[PDB]
Design a protein around this ligand. Structure first.
Ligand SMILES: [Fe+3]
Ligand SMILES: [Fe+3]
Ligand SMILES: [O-]
Ligand SMILES: [O-]
Ligand SMILES: [Zn+2]
Ligand SMILES: [Zn+2]
Lengths: 323, 323
């Protein structure tokens, strides 16, 4: 009935049109060391975040899930300021990134001491049921991530802790898959440890263009996410046209009640500013929060996707996911 | 004539008895995501640090080089509070940790953009000549680190940026070697790119117990640090007994003008508190800031080492290094 947001409990029936994976702030681990040349511009960042929320609102979005990992710039008080200003529901996460794009040392050390998995579980429980730091804000989802072609032993501690915390809380699990791999493995390993497939979103599924792969993942009953629309030519990502072709295939197979769509935008980059060089810059020009509604969804309409199906993906699925 | 400390410029003639490598604060990268259960307790942390500064003061220490990496909890305003309270000089660093104990994703990403090495030089320069963040404190040393058996291509970016920055500033370089490897390779690679051997300290050289390895590194003209006295049974460390035996052999060969000593303490761990399991716990029991002066230094004296040699290592060498 309720979900925890950055503005406290909101009824699930009032979530409305929802983007399941968007980052208002994000920084790659290691950004914290470049503070002198890449310090956080709080108020200009707010204006950018707020303006992104307003772009999203102009297409009817009422809720955004922001699954920024704990050490990647997750800032719940900042997200609360966005939501208070814009009236948008924002759900944040508890969790850590995968090995190759994260900071493994800290919890690697605690595995050596033999308390890592228990420490992760305790973090998850605290941030789900009490609050993050002193913000008073509970996370609404557990964020999980796995490496390319592998759920490493390090990563599996988080999967196991996540399953245990979901058994205790009912919290939704949202995942990251690296370069279109481990989708079925993620679902199977979480289920092995008692997670609920109805509360799982396997992410970055648009990273794999083989509809057999998605069907392997869908058979577990989980949700999948085509959540990187507009990312092309980097992090191994396929083209948007490949994303559209794979999605139409599944949708023409009757899989609407399990598919959610998003962009995985980074609206404010933490650390030092940058501009992508000449080739990616072109491929990445549609990586913004209006892309799905200005470009992708008109194309889906022309391919015969009906409003009820879209509405199923943007409204019905998040509502079922969080209830 | 002057070195920058966390209380502005200090004459090199006034540094006195110096510990070349001690961490007041330190956290393994990834500690930033454990904020709810591992918050930084400022008051108590200050109390603990101030006490470490006084324990060092009672054995004549007037200066400490704190080489904590930028993303490992380096906190120059906090260090300044310790120094102002205690009168100790504290010199801090600019630098990143090696791959296996750090967060590479951030600067790995900037290498894809082609800007990483330049960005690292820009960071070194700003922190050495302008200030860290808005603290007004300049780093006094560049901190470098490499992996076990390799100076990776990621690490080499920082090595080349450090050599570049030293050519511009005359700043001292302090290094971390992993598990007794790559001492000769660090010196050779730094000198290849124009770095000054009189301004380099190759660290954790006590991790290697073969005097030929040490002599190989010494042949480059650089300083070397037996800076891990008290660490045993962890991180591949050999015993203090092995440390002493190696150190006596070098001192008996006349190498005292190139050797410096320290413990590499972590006086306040960042993130969540922990307790070492019982095998490691007793082996580590001497890892504190008085161990040199209570245990190691007097046993060296019993073995014939003269007071003027010790003073060369604790006083003469830091003075030579920073001038
Ligand atoms: Fe994401
Ligand atoms: Fe150290
Ligand atoms: O992501
Ligand atoms: O260290
Ligand atoms: Zn992701
Ligand atoms: Zn070190």
């Amino acid at each position: 009935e309720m979900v925890e947001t950055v503005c406290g409990p909101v009824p699930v029936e009032q979530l409305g049109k929802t983007l399941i994976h968007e980052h208002f702030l994000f920084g790659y681990p290691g950004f914290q060391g470049d503070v002198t040349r890449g310090t956080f511009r709080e108020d200009e960042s707010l204006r950018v975040a707020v303006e992104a929320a307003e772009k999203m609102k102009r297409h009817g979005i009422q809720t955004v899930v922001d699954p920024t990992p704990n050490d990647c710039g997750r800032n719940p008080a900042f997200l609360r300021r966005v939501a208070e200003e814009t009236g948008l529901n924002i759900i944040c996460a508890t969790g850590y990134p995968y090995e190759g794009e994260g900071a493994p040392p800290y919890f690697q050390f605690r595995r050596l001491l033999g308390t890592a998995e228990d420490d992760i579980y305790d973090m998850f429980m605290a941030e789900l049921t009490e609050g993050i730091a002193d913000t008073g804000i509970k996370a609404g989802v557990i964020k999980l991530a796995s490496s390319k072609g592998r759920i490493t032993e390090y990563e599996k501690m988080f999967f196991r802790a996540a399953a245990r915390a979901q058994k205790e809380t009912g919290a939704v699990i949202i995942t990251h898959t690296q370069e279109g791999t481990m989708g079925p493995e993620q679902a199977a390993y979480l289920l092995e440890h008692g997670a609920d497939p109805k509360k799982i979103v396997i992410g970055h599924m648009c990273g794999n263009t083989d509809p057999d792969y998605h069907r392997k993942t869908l058979a577990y009953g989980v949700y999948i996410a085509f959540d990187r629309f507009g990312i092309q030519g980097m992090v191994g990502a396929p083209t948007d046209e490949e994303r559209v072709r794979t999605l139409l295939a599944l949708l023409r197979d009757g899989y609407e009640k399990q598919i959610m769509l998003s962009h995985d935008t980074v609206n404010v980059w933490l650390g030092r500013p940058f501009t992508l060089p000449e080739p990616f810059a072109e491929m990445m020009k549609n990586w913004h929060v209006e892309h799905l509604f200005v470009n992708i969804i008109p194309a889906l309409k022309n391919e015969g996707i009906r409003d009820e199906v879209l509405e199923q993906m943007f409204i019905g699925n998040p509502a079922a996911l969080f209830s």
